[PDB]
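User: I'm putting together a small comparison set for a docking exercise, and I want a reference complex before I start. The sequence is below, and the ligand is magnesium ion. Could you produce the 3D structure with the ligand included, as structure tokens?
Assistant: Of course. I'll restate your input first, then give the structure tokens for the complex.
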Amino acid sequence: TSIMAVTFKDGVILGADSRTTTGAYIANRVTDKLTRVHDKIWCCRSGSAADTQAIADIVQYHLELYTSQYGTPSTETAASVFKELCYENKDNLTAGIIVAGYDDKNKGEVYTIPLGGSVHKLPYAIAGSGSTFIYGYCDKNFRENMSKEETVDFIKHSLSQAIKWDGSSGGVIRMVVLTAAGVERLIFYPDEYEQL
Amino acid sequence: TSIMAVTFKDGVILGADSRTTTGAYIANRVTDKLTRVHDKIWCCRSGSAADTQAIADIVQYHLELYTSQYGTPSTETAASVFKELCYENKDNLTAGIIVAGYDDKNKGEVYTIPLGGSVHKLPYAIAGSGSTFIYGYCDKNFRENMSKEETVDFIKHSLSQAIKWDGSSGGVIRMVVLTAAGVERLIFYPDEYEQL
Amino acid sequence: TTTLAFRFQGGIIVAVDSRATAGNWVASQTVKKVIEINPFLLGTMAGGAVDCQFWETWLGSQCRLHELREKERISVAAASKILSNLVYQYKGAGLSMGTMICGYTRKEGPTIYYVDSDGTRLKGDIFCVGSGQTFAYGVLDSNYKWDLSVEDALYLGKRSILAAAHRDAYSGGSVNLYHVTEDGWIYHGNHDVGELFWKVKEEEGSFNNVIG
Amino acid sequence: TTIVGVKFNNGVVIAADTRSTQGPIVADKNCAKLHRISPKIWCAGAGTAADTEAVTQLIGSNIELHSLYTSREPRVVSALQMLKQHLFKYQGHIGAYLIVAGVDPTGSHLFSIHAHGSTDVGYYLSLGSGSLAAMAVLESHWKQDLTKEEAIKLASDAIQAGIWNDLGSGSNVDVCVMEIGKDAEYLRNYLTPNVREEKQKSYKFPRGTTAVLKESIVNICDIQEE
Amino acid sequence: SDPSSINGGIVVAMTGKDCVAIACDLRLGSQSLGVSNKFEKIFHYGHVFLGITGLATDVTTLNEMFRYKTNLYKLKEERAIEPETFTQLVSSSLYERRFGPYFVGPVVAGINSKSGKPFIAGFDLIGCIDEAKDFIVSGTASDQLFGMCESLYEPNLEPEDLFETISQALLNAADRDALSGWGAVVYIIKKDEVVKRYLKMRQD
Amino acid sequence: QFNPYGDNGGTILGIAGEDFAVLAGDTRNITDYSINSRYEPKVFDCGDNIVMSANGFAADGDALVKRFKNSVKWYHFDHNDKKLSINSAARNIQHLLYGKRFFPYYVHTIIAGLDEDGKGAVYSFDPVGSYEREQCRAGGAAASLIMPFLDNQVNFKNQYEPGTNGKVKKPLKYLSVEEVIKLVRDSFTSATERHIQVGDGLEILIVTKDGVRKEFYELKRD
Amino acid sequence: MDIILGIRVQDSVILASSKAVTRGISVLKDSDDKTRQLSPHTLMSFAGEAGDTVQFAEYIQANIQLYSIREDYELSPQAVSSFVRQELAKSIRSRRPYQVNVLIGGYDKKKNKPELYQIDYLGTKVELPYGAHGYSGFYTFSLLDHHYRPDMTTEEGLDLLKLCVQELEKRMPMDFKGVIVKIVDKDGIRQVDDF
Amino acid sequence: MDIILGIRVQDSVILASSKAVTRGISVLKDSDDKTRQLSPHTLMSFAGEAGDTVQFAEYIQANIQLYSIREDYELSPQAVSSFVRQELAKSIRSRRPYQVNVLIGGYDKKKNKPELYQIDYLGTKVELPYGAHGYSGFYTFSLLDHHYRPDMTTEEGLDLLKLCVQELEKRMPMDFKGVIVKIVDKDGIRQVDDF
Amino acid sequence: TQQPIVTGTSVISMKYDNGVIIAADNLGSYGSLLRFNGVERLIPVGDNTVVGISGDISDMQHIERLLKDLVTENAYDNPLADAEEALEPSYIFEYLATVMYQRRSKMNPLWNAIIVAGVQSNGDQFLRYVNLLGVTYSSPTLATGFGAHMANPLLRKVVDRESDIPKTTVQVAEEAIVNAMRVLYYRDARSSRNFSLAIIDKNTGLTFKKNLQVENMKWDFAKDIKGYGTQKI
Ligand SMILES: *[B]([O])([O])[C]([C][C]([C])[C])[N]C(=O)[C]([C]C1=[C][C]=[C][C]=[C]1)[N]C(=O)C1=[C]N=[C][C]=N1
Ligand SMILES: *[B]([O])([O])[C]([C][C]([C])[C])[N]C(=O)[C]([C]C1=[C][C]=[C][C]=[C]1)[N]C(=O)C1=[C]N=[C][C]=N1
Ligand SMILES: *[B]([O])([O])[C]([C][C]([C])[C])[N]C(=O)[C]([C]C1=[C][C]=[C][C]=[C]1)[N]C(=O)C1=[C]N=[C][C]=N1
Ligand SMILES: *[B]([O])([O])[C]([C][C]([C])[C])[N]C(=O)[C]([C]C1=[C][C]=[C][C]=[C]1)[N]C(=O)C1=[C]N=[C][C]=N1
Ligand SMILES: [Cl-]
Ligand SMILES: [Cl-]
Ligand SMILES: [Mg+2]
Ligand SMILES: [Mg+2]
Ligand SMILES: [Mg+2]
Ligand SMILES: [Mg+2]
Ligand SMILES: [Mg+2]
Ligand SMILES: [Mg+2]
């Protein structure tokens, strides 16, 4: 799995591959790992598909019930709910989740939640098996306050490499853009990103 | 360990960190992993220090005896001797070696020999625990027929990142330049490469 | 450990050793392996030191409560069965006990019950329990009669422990003797094996193997 | 065990503590961990005691025969090569962890050796259970162009760090100095900072306190004449 | 299971003024079962004394081996082996079985016939030499012996005082060990006379 | 796998006199081959003229001492400020230890004080609660080194009277507080020499009818 | 196999050895002689793993008989016992060790003394007044400690041996089907046919 | 414990049960009665793990005696055996199962027929003419297959039972110290004191 | 029972004449991967206590929340929350020490080694250690993980016993701490160059220093080191 979330000037963008594997067999080559827990709070999922789905479903339920009582939750609040589930059930879960959201007050924010259940607020985050191969590239090429087009290119090039080297990662590169303008879905096919 | 060999216009350059670890304790912070098996045939060593030393010592012996009978050996020949030892003793060895040399006829050549004992001739090669983090960076930034200065910068930046992310790698960045001009040793200290 | 108890004309003889070990390390040579449950009941201790101690002094509390409630001395059968039923609840948990519950009552006469951490409860005339039980059995079985004097019975029990104290590496220290009648038990002294061995060897003419 | 080696201006110094342990028990309080491979090549040993002794004697023996064969004073690299190839062959089962030092016609040298047969070069080195305490001192106080007096001080201070802070190390500090163009000086018990205080009481018994069964003269002499 | 504590037993050696003392218990057992109370663990080859604890079959085998070697030594050298030399021979012999060792704890004791200097030495099961000035201990109650020796011992004891110290060290150590005891022997060794004493101790 | 137990080393020693009692223990605290503290008190005054030490795994040791001190407090509340006798303290500690029979306090407990007749008393416990009144007891790492020395020098074992040759034993004469402290100091000096987990300092608590007094002595720090 | 006993009296050595041969579930034989005559005045009883016991005993027997023919002379019990110990001490570090424990009862015609040696499969030799292998000793040594006197006659030795066998028959779980008793003295080796 | 046998003849059921109680090394008792009377015309013998055997037997005994008092009526052997089976069938899926095998010999006063039930610790019930638990059956069933004719008298049953015990005493390795024999018929339960 | 995932390495500390110093690097390792480079492992509680935590970072963050909640709870119905009834280092430690031992006793430990450094009401220095097993001890110098092996030896050369504390100034103590951090960077394969340092003085209060770096490092001698024995070039 190759997933990443990157903050930029206008907000935040989530990116992911589309490969689900049972050993070396690709069970699903068009998976959607970018999932919605609230209107402008999404998450990237890595690890167990069952665990991350079960978690994401529960979080969406919590934020829906939060919204009905206290209005729109912050991205920090969403990350906290994810953390509470991942930390308290650490013995029985295998989930690496990146939480990304857009407030008007806080703008684009990214929280990463690795296996342990710890939370880390970052400018950008990378995760999944394929992330190991792009630490060098991402560290060297990331800048703060990038444009939308620059951030899309940064994510596209990064996940392109992660896919190239990691067998567990592949298929299409899905992306979700979170700004004041709204929610935009982007897709990029092998013929496009492989020649980069 | 972070090691790499890169061919360029005038020949080939070998690069390595200087960290040797026993678990999390750094047994040696100024190790020389760039070792000489012939005048202009060197190797990078990764894995077991004892195994790679024992192998390198034997190879140097074989190439010294080869030279006395048949004159200067090719880099391919050196790689073959390494392979023969690593392949035939694969059950008892833990050695990841990159062989790099300079002929006048063949110019700069690089052969990588991973755990199995297989041989792979490449334009450039990366190996060791820290190499995982710079596959993306190296693939994106490598060009053929680079200059000496460009190749030094390529290796310096690459190993800088590998060191930054890998705990097993660190200390100084050693390099050895192999050209028609001769053999040049280069060293780069933390204060220099960390700020890159 | 070597502990024995046997019925005879004059009541019951109880004899025990004094050693406690942790591996090859001798932890103590002065252990009281006989519990004075009341003026009429004795319990022997073998196996786990604490398990035997804790639960046999607990047994004394249950026996006291019985005679407070029933205005009558508890039987040896009832007392032994309280302990065996207790350890049976703990079966599998890892308790380690080999015990004789010895007493005299009017209705029963002199009675001995072997109680065990596996739940075994056996009534009998002679019992030897512990790592050195086999050594004690040899002397006992070849010299036992119903018609023994209190004096001769006491010596046989003392001698049988000595036999085991010598051969069994995990037995020794000293010998504690008790004699149980219908007016209660009667203590018959602590006998150091370091002095008893040379005394018995000389007087009895035994242990000709050893040089003294 | 704490063993160290320190290079200086005109040579090299090695040092060691004197504690040997079997589990949590001290087997020997004044153990000799500095071994002589040749007159001017000495090494300190950590790990399994019989192995550090045996592997040193064997290589030291062969080094002597080699020196006689070649009519040359032995070199540290020769001892190093012979030790590493021997240890490698036995795949770490010979538990000898060595700091090899010495002076020869090539110059002064300092190396470390591990049980699996890997070697390392350095200006300052430390091995054993107290190597972390020692290396902390060496990393704090070492510099280039040390004098002989400064190197001995640094080496013994590094051993002391092991003695006091590592339970696997204790008692005394042994030192051996190997300077170029000079005899190697072996300083047995260079420091003695762990003398036992006087006991409160004398436990000398009154004669006849122990009970005896038999007495006899033992014949240690040979069969006699006449 | 552990070979060094199947049979059980102990040896202790001490130095005094112009003398050495070596002592051992007499027990041989099969774990809990006491089998023999006459199993002596101290042997001598000329004026050099060797005590051996550990697995009894190896104790016997090594005694027979060192008798073999010291007898050939004497025929060729035309003199009795000395304690310092014998110590090196024991070390050599044990280490040659590095990866298939004799499960023993040898203890050498004696006086050099030429210099007159008292000598004691200990070994692990594989040959490492412990050449102590004061005392050497070995066996299943080695910890106990270390404690006794470390408190009771003082240097330059006269032969008849040294006898009392080593005897009390052995006896009280053995009494805290299940696999040691069943009698004891003490050798008092001077340059040209040796006295052997059997001690009266508790037989449990 | 998580291992809930550890070994903090150390060694303790209790000796009962004729009208006094001492409970000594080294002040070194360790894990593996590292020293945690050169002065970490191990022997504690628990009130009612009782001193206690639970040697072994320090976390279980501190927990037990803490719970016993607590038991003394509640004994006063529940029984009209009655003094907890040393024998009653000992039995109470047996139940504390056995309460965790199947997940034991991994410690070697010793308490010292005076019995109800004013004589010196030392009680010794195993980890699971079996106990016994003794005249002499060493506990912990170097217990195997010290106990044989105490059998010889406190109870005069294997000692006989000169001239009689094994016939007459050495009489069991009583030891003064000055004589006991000498034996304690020599025990720990000897234990320090041959045991790596013993050293740094020795702290002795002396119990008499007048109260609890402390004495501290330096030990070798290697 | 199971129970083998030995007792050295004034002028003879007496060896008692069980008759049962049990293979797991069933008792296949109740008249097995677990002994071999090594020489006219030396008898060896044995017990251990199946096959190994007889194979070892007969191998030792052959070697001693070979020695006897070569030198026209009977080895002392001490000498034979030392030879046997060495074979077992050699055996214990073999690829597949002999799993055999033995008792060697002999009469030394030179010293006019009976001698009993106990040797286990490790090569652990001891000379004793009375000995046993396996669980036998656990019951019998206490009786022998009490009753044995070294000036005993052969008839007194047999009575003391009956007391040992009776105790074993009372307290041991396994039915060893009685014992075959053999006496070794100055006149050689003979079997007590009624026991 | 070890050997328990049962044989149903014309007009009675005969249960034989060993007297030995062994703990590892020693035979602690040689007169143990491994049976309980559940009702005047129903006897249960038992063998299995120590403690569990008696605890189970006495628990069953108490329950049947309780039933007898409540209804002033004796349950049929078939009914008792079914109750026992259910307890064991319940037990086998417990936290700690009863490790007990039983034989239930009873005389049904309504049908005037002897009945023998064999039940193992799993709760496996079978009605048989003759039965056994443990290794006993391996030796005895062949003899019973040959000699049992179903119309035998009680005296013929005892003779056939002696032939079983003799075979066990010959071929079994363990000394079970003989058996206590008990007969269950129309007149109730009695013990054969000489066997 | 668990295994630690994201981990923090050594926490080192010592007493000096007027207070205590504590330090810890800013790294959150993920096995051999040096994953997170901006993790604060010194967490102040009031203006008189600093809790330094090593080991599992998720469990550290849990402990951080407990301490934050402890301050909140102490303020409830407490007019002297910022005065006489303020939280003491000894109160904060004993609380943690209770939790650590309880959690190990339920076989579900907080996988940490903790050092509570602070100054009490009466001006006394407080410095005590606790870990996943509930083991506690105090000393003039305290360190966790690799610090125990490498820092303590260096810090004990400054304060070897109790009587050395009044003789040690804050400048000498800080110098020793900063040197120890450098040594750990040389030798600990799971350490970082960036660290935080906290000083709790009885006069000048709590000084919390962020974004410190290991400097004055010796690496030049590496150029002379060639091969592993016989190699000259
Ligand atoms: B990715 O590779 O981590 C991916 C992300 C997931 C949210 C779709 N996970 C998987 O494909 C996992 C296996 C796995 C791979 C790498 C690391 C950890 C786990 N697959 C599944 O969970 C799976 C596979 N087949 C069917 C159902 N679920
Ligand atoms: B590098 O990390 O692979 C390095 C290269 C080596 C040639 C110096 N290897 C080591 O440091 C190895 C351990 C190791 C780390 C990572 C992967 C594989 C192996 N160390 C040793 O071989 C070693 C350590 N301490 C003493 C001696 N040898
Ligand atoms: B006895 O040997 O069984 C003895 C009886 C007990 C009441 C003191 N038990 C022990 O010595 C046991 C060990 C043991 C040895 C042999 C068989 C069974 C058990 N020792 C302890 O329980 C113990 C208690 N505290 C300290 C040391 N040892
Ligand atoms: B040191 O701690 O490395 C020290 C140096 C040695 C060369 C004198 N090592 C020892 O003392 C070793 C420790 C050790 C214990 C157990 C297995 C392997 C190593 N001790 C011995 O080799 C030893 C132990 N008992 C007797 C003799 N020697
Ligand atoms: Cl999915
Ligand atoms: Cl290397
Ligand atoms: Mg290898
Ligand atoms: Mg690094
Ligand atoms: Mg004994
Ligand atoms: Mg003993
Ligand atoms: Mg010490
Ligand atoms: Mg034997």
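The longest strand of chain B covers residues 95-102. The two ends of chain B are 20 Å apart (CA to CA).
User: Thanks, that's exactly what I needed.
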